[PDB]
Write a structure and sequence with these properties.
alpha+beta; D-Maltodextrin-Binding Protein, domain 2; five-stranded antiparallel sheet; 26 strands; Serotransferrin; signal; iron; Transferrin
Length: about 675
């Protein structure tokens, strides 16, 4: 079909007509076409697409947020990168360069000297002041005046010093051009180097452009949003905001996003960077930056799950909203706003609601459709916390959330203190054939508690993905039983069960669970994937069943990842990976509050005296493990500022990640697109 692009000037409108003409040529008779709808401005192109009069346009961050707001409600469908297919550089980072050991944190700039790249610029002002908005003295309008009282002097190019002198103190006159060496990225940075100002709100690339030698940067460092500093080389881990450089948008519903991609893509390949000589898609013969930015290297599809909020990022959004809405809480103090939990089900909403009233307002509830939606919500700001299993802890991590409290299941006189890292997913094989290794495990017979399990599938299959390469996880083992397959695979054809319960993920199956898989080994099975607590539990006659009558633990041996072999005695050093417990996650900030609020709450309705029924019990569920596993003794503190990686272990993260190449999830790729 034909895509109606939208230009905002006659020049840009001409270039669109060449794009239409040049396509009807190098594009098959039935390929992506491109019509041209010119308008007066960006906001008009936006509204036109909203009205289905236009199909798409390319906008900067600012206007991207503008296209999201109703009634427009548009979303990002295609981005432009400025590097290689390895180093896309689709975004840029608004940072705040400072001096080593300066002595201050973002949350305490009050009474400082700042260097902005120029008033009204994004990285240099909108974003920095947007963030510091409520930290300014009332009235907050005019804006220039308020920022003056905050920053005890500074350099704000293009700002009217005549009415508010404080902003041109470091650079009198506030020269809005190069005539002023403290104007711009380079200039604002020079305003810090020269020692004039304390902080230089600039871009991530700024310091690397005004300083070649590395030993030079060391004296400089970034200011992070969680009141911390870090090396200017680590901006991706410490930036005031992440903003998309240039984005193609379309109606969120019926915006023809796929068709827009089929055009842009099939176009960057015909007339893309240096591609053709007949037409330079990213070049403007008449003027600069038309339809696409001149410096664009190509296009990149945006994951469909992505929407403007998630795309711009929490920092960005919060900053621009302050700027445009201007709304701050009356009584600050930071008494920790109620924690918004996320229910992903009716019964979960109910249990959460009961929890709410019994929290005296400390806890609030939010309802999202899916575990992934909640996660998006905890990123957005719409939700604050929630518990997730290892698989989703990983996904929340890649999305920027963090683990704060891990659900503990064992009991002691100090459950909250000592954290639990979970059991171990080991690989057991009959020591009858001493020649089997993690490597020659291919083409043999396996045993899986059930496809989709942590210990009997995810971990092993994920750690073994390298050999498999392709997503044909069954075509790796000659046979074996893994309940849950297509009921006829190489792994399902070795499972008993009736004509219906044949190879099924339930008790009605024989080789199901941690016991069934061990059985599968005692029979038609070379390798069996289970947990450390399965061997000395299904042997010694501890199982009065026919097969496990009294098998011997000593006759089985554990396989280690490095390649060697070891007994079930010291599995600790011969396990595939460690399966974690569920853990509550939250946005980086809010961490202290969640950590705090969830403690008191745990003392009031936790695993206290068996006084439920007549009182609310936070770890008991109407139906089954609702907001929390019903076997959660307490919410242990992760002590160290555990991050999804430090909390899952390297083995675990590797497993899940590989496995995610076959079992995609909309949320995960969207977050990855923003941070690979």
């Amino acid at each position: 079909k034909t895509v109606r692009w939208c230009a905002v000037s006659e020049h840009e409108a001409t270039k669109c007509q060449s794009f239409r003409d040049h396509m009807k040529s190098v594009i098959p008779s039935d390929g992506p076409s491109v019509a041209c709808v010119k308008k007066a401005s960006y906001l008009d192109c936006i509204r036109a697409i909203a009205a289905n009069e236009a199909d798409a346009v390319t906008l900067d961050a600012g206007l991207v947020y503008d296209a999201y707001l109703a009634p427009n409600n548009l979303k990002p469908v295609v981005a432009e990168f400025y590097g290689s297919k390895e180093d896309p550089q689709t975004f840029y980072y608004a940072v705040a360069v400072v001096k080593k050991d300066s002595g201050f944190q973002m949350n305490q700039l009050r009474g400082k000297k700042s260097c902005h790249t120029g008033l009204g610029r994004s990285a240099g002002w909108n974003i920095p002041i947007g963030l510091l908005y409520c930290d300014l003295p009332e009235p907050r309008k005019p804006l220039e005046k308020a920022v003056a009282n905050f920053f005890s002097g500074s350099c704000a190019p293009c700002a009217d010093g005549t009415d508010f002198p404080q902003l041109c103190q470091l650079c009198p006159g506030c020269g809005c051009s190069t005539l002023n060496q403290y104007f711009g990225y380079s200039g604002a940075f020079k305003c810090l180097k020269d020692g004039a100002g304390d902080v230089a709100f600039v871009k991530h690339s700024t310091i690397f452009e005004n300083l070649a030698n590395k030993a030079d940067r060391d004296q400089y460092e970034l200011l992070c949003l969680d009141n911390t500093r870090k090396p200017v080389d680590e901006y991706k881990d410490c930036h005031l905001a992440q903003v998309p450089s240039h984005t193609v948008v379309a109606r969120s519903m019926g915006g023809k996003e796929d068709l827009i991609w089929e055009l842009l893509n099939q176009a960057q390949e015909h007339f893309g960077k240096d591609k053709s000589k007949e037409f330079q898609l990213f070049s403007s013969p008449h003027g600069k930056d038309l339809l696409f930015k001149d410096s664009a290297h190509g296009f990149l599809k945006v994951p469909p799950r992505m929407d403007a909020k998630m795309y711009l990022g929490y920092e960005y959004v919060t900053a621009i909203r302050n700027l445009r809405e201007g709304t701050c809480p009356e009584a600050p103090t930071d008494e920790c706003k109620p924690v918004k939990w996320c229910a992903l089900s009716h019964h979960e909403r109910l249990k959460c609601d009961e929890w709410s009233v019994n929290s005296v307002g400390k806890i609030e509830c939010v309802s999202a459709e899916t575990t992934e939606d909640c996660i998006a919500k905890i990123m957005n700001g719409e939700a604050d916390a929630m518990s997730l299993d290892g698989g989703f802890v990983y996904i929340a991590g890649k999305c920027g959330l963090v683990p704060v409290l891990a659900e503990n299941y064992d009991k002691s006189d100090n459950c909250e203190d000592t954290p639990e890292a979970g059991y171990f997913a080991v690989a057991v094989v009959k020591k009858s054939a001493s020649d089997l290794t993690w490597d020659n495990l291919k083409g043999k017979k396996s045993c899986h508690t059930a496809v989709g399990r942590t210990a009997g599938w995810n971990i092993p299959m994920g750690l073994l993905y390298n050999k498999i390469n392709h997503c044909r996880f069954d075509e790796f083992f000659s046979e074996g039983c893994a309940p849950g397959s297509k009921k006829d695979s190489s792994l399902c054809k070795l499972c008993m069960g009736s004509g219906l319960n044949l190879c099924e993920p339930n008790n009605k199956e024989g080789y199901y669970g941690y016991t069934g898989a061990f059985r599968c080994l005692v029979e038609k099975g070379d390798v069996a994937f289970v947990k450390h607590q399965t061997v000395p539990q299904n042997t010694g006659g501890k199982n009065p069943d026919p097969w496990a009558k009294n098998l011997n633990e000593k006759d089985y041996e554990l396989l280690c990842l490095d390649g060697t072999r070891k007994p079930v005695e010291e599995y600790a050093n011969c396990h595939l990976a460690r399966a974690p417990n569920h853990a509550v996650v939250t946005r980086k900030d809010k961490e202290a509050c969640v950590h705090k609020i969830l403690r008191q709450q745990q003392h009031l309705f936790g695993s206290d005296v068996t006084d439920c029924s007549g009182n609310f019990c936070l770890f008991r569920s109407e139906t089954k493990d609702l907001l929390f596993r019903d076997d959660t003794v307490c919410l242990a503190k992760l002590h160290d500022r555990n991050t999804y990686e430090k909390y899952l272990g390297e083995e675990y993260v590797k497993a899940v990640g590989n496995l995610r190449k076959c079992s995609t999830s909309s949320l995960l790729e969207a977050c990855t697109f923003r941070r690979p």
